[PDB]
Scaffold this active site. Structure first.
Site, PDB file in Angstrom:
ATOM      1  N   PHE A  32       0.687  -1.155  -0.183  1.00 59.72           N
ATOM      2  CA  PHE A  32       0.066   0.072   0.043  1.00 59.72           C
ATOM      3  C   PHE A  32       0.826   1.138   0.020  1.00 59.72           C
ATOM      4  O   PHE A  32       1.968   1.264   0.631  1.00 59.72           O
ATOM      5  CB  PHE A  32      -0.717   0.122   1.164  1.00 59.72           C
ATOM      6  CG  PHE A  32      -1.470   1.091   1.818  1.00 59.72           C
ATOM      7  CD1 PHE A  32      -0.941   2.273   2.460  1.00 59.72           C
ATOM      8  CD2 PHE A  32      -2.805   1.164   1.319  1.00 59.72           C
ATOM      9  CE1 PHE A  32      -1.670   3.229   2.988  1.00 59.72           C
ATOM     10  CE2 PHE A  32      -3.532   2.228   1.788  1.00 59.72           C
ATOM     11  CZ  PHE A  32      -3.135   3.145   2.573  1.00 59.72           C
ATOM     12  N   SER A  98       5.410  -5.815   1.856  1.00 57.00           N
ATOM     13  CA  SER A  98       4.546  -5.215   2.815  1.00 57.00           C
ATOM     14  C   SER A  98       3.056  -5.942   2.708  1.00 57.00           C
ATOM     15  O   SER A  98       3.080  -7.084   2.943  1.00 57.00           O
ATOM     16  CB  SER A  98       4.564  -3.707   2.441  1.00 57.00           C
ATOM     17  OG  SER A  98       3.803  -3.009   3.772  1.00 57.00           O
ATOM     18  N   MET A  99       2.243  -5.370   2.473  1.00 54.21           N
ATOM     19  CA  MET A  99       0.627  -6.089   2.274  1.00 54.21           C
ATOM     20  C   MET A  99       0.898  -7.420   1.405  1.00 54.21           C
ATOM     21  O   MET A  99      -0.172  -8.204   1.591  1.00 54.21           O
ATOM     22  CB  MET A  99      -0.322  -5.089   1.567  1.00 54.21           C
ATOM     23  CG  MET A  99      -1.141  -4.164   2.652  1.00 54.21           C
ATOM     24  SD  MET A  99      -2.579  -3.483   1.731  1.00 54.21           S
ATOM     25  CE  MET A  99      -3.659  -4.662   1.661  1.00 54.21           C
ATOM     26  N   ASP A 228      13.249   0.247   9.235  1.00 55.35           N
ATOM     27  CA  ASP A 228      11.574   0.259   9.036  1.00 55.35           C
ATOM     28  C   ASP A 228      10.792   0.838  10.122  1.00 55.35           C
ATOM     29  O   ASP A 228      10.759   0.445  11.127  1.00 55.35           O
ATOM     30  CB  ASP A 228      10.971  -1.105   8.532  1.00 55.35           C
ATOM     31  CG  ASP A 228       9.951  -1.306   8.109  1.00 55.35           C
ATOM     32  OD1 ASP A 228       9.089  -0.377   8.280  1.00 55.35           O
ATOM     33  OD2 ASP A 228       9.699  -1.989   6.986  1.00 55.35           O
ATOM     34  N   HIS A 257      11.204   1.101   5.335  1.00 62.88           N
ATOM     35  CA  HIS A 257      10.000   0.453   4.796  1.00 62.88           C
ATOM     36  C   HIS A 257       9.921   0.262   3.174  1.00 62.88           C
ATOM     37  O   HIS A 257       9.661  -0.833   2.613  1.00 62.88           O
ATOM     38  CB  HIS A 257       8.379   0.821   5.194  1.00 62.88           C
ATOM     39  CG  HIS A 257       7.701  -0.057   5.142  1.00 62.88           C
ATOM     40  ND1 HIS A 257       7.615  -1.192   5.431  1.00 62.88           N
ATOM     41  CD2 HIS A 257       6.401  -0.023   4.278  1.00 62.88           C
ATOM     42  CE1 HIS A 257       6.421  -2.121   5.196  1.00 62.88           C
ATOM     43  NE2 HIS A 257       5.751  -1.280   4.282  1.00 62.88           N
TER      44      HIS A 257
END
Lengths: 277, 277
Positions: A32, A98-99, A228, A257
Site C-alpha cells: 500500500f 508489505s501488504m 523500517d 519500509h
C-alpha cells in the site's frame, strides 16, 4: 491487460496485470498504497537475469477496478488464485512486499503449493501485528491502526504526504537514495487508487497469519530493513524467522519500509541470489 | 437520534437510537430495565470486528419517550419494524437480550425474514414463561408476575436494588466480575425509564411465543447463563433448544442473567463466532 476476479453490482472487478520476459515466472505483489509499477527496479533486474516477471495491481489500487467490497485477505488470496489459474503458471516464485506478504501466506495456506517453487517475504506483516494478550510480540495495539484509518478518511491526499515521509525515511534519504520526483510519482499513484480501498486496506494489516505459516512448505526468503518505521523489524521479521526457521533470512542495515526503491541494489542482490538456488 | 413510531395524545412517541460503524448491520435489543447503552461491551467488540451496530431504547426505557400505551409484544415488534424500514436495513442480524428476545421472535414470526440474515437469543424468555396446565415447563404462575407488578408500583426505586442483586448475582460477582460503579450506572439507567413502563413491562414477560418459534427460518444462536436467577435456564433456554433444535446452543457456566457485563468475553467470543459463519 486485465483479469476478471469477481463482480460488483452491474460491473466486473478486473485487476490490471503485466507479463514480461521468458524464463521461470516470478509474481511480484505490491504494498500500500502503490501498484505493480512500484517494482520497476526489481522488474528490470529480473528481466536482465532471464526471468519472466508478472505484476498485478491489488483490487482498489493502481489501474485495477475500485470496488467497495472484498478488502480482506481471503478475498485478496482468492484474487491471486484467479490470476495464477488463469495464466496457468507452474514452478512459480511468489514475492510479496508489505501488504503483499499477506497474499503469499494466505494463498499458500488456503490453496497449497502445487504451482509454487519458492516464496519471498520482503518488509513482512507476519506473524501478527496486533499487540494483544495472546500476542505480546505485536507492534501496536489496535487503536494505533484505527488512527491510521481515521487519518485516511479525514483527507487521503494529505495523508499520503505524511505516509511517504516515514515510508521512505525521507529525512535520511531524500536527495541520495530517493529523488523528489520519485516521491511525486508515488504520491500520484496513491491518489489514483480508490477512495474506499485507501481507508479499508489498513484494517487488513493486523490480520493474524500465525496459522498460515506452518503451511509454507517450499523454500522461503525473509528480508527486512532495520530502519523500517512502518513495520518494526523486532515485531515482524525477527519473530517471523523463529516461526519459519527453514527460511533464508536477510536484514538490510538502515533500510526503511520503502526499500524496493531506496535500497534496490541490496534487495536485488539478495533476491537474485535466492532465486538462483 | 430518534425515530418516530406513533402518537400519544398531543405528542409523538420517539425511540432513541444510535448507528455506528460500517459493514453488516447488527441490531441489538436490550432487556429490562436498561437501555441500548447496556450493550457497550458487545458494541465495542462488534465495531472492532467490522460490523455496523444499531442500538435503540425500547419505548418507556432509556432516552425514548415514555408513553402509557403500547406495552405488548405486537407493538414492540411494530416499533422494531419501523426502525428496520426507516433505516432500510438488509441482511441484518437481530440480537435480543432478555425482553429483547421477545421482539426478535415476534418480529420474525409476523413480518418474516426478508431483511434478516441471522438471529441470536441471549438470556431468552422463550418459549413461554407462565406455568400453566398446557405448559408445565413454565417458570411460575400468574400470581408471581402480578407480585412483581405490585412491587414496582409500590416503590420502583427500591425495587431496582433487589432486582439488580439477582440480575447480576452480586453476592458472587460484586467486586470481581462487576464493580459497585457499574451497578450504580445500571440503577441510574433504570430510574430514568418511565414510571408506567416500569410496571407494565413485567406483564409482557409471560407472553406465549410457542407459535412464533416454528417460523424462525434463518440461522439462530441461543445463549444462556447457568446461574441465571431471573430467567431459570431449565424453563427457558433448555426447553427453547428442544423446540428449535437447529439453533447453535451455548450454555455459559456459572453466569447470571446480566451476563452481557459479567461474562462479556464469553458472550463476545460466542457472538463473533456465530456472526462469522
Amino acid at each position: 491487460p486485465f483479469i476478471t476476479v469477481g463482480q460488483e453490482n452491474s460491473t466486473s472487478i478486473d485487476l490490471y496485470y503485466e507479463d514480461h520476459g521468458a524464463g521461470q515466472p516470478v509474481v511480484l505483489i505490491h504494498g500500500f498504497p502503490l501498484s505493480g509499477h512500484s517494482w520497476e527496479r526489481q522488474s528490470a533486474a529480473l528481466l536482465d537475469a532471464g526471468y519472466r516477471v508478472i505484476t498485478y495491481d491489488r483490487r482498489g489500487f493502481g489501474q485495477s477496478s475500485q470496488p467497495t467490497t472484498g478488502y480482506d485477505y481471503d478475498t485478496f488470496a482468492a484474487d491471486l488464485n484467479t490470476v495464477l489459474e488463469t495464466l496457468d503458471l507452474q514452478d512459480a516464485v511468489l514475492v510479496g512486499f508489505s501488504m503483499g506478504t499477506g497474499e503469499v501466506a494466505r494463498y499458500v495456506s488456503s490453496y497449497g503449493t502445487a504451482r509454487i517453487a519458492k516464496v519471498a517475504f520482503l518488509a513482512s506483516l507476519e506473524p501478527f501485528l496486533l499487540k494483544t494478550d495472546d500476542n505480546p510480540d505485536g507492534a501496536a495495539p489496535k487503536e494505533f491502526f484505527d488512527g491510521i484509518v481515521a487519518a485516511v478518511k479525514a483527507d487521503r491526499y494529505a495523508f499520503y504526504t505524511g505516509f511517504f515521509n516515514d515510508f521512505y525515511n525521507l529525512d535520511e534519504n531524500l536527495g541520495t537514495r530517493i529523488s523528489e520526483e520519485a516521491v511525486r510519482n508515488s504520491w500520484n499513484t496513491a491518489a489514483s487508487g480508490g477512495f474506499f480501498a485507501a481507508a479499508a486496506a489498513p484494517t487488513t494489516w493486523y490480520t493474524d497469519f500465525r496459522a498460515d505459516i506452518p503451511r509454507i512448505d517450499v523454500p522461503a526468503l525473509i528480508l527486512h530493513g532495520t530502519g523500517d518505521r512502518t513495520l518494526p523489524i523486532e515485531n515482524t521479521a525477527r519473530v517471523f524467522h523463529k516461526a519459519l526457521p527453514s527460511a533464508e533470512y536477510v536484514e538490510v542495515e538502515g533500510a526503511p519500509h520503502g526499500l524496493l526503491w531506496t535500497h534496490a541494489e541490496e534487495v536485488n542482490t539478495a533476491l537474485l541470489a535466492f532465486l538462483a538456488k
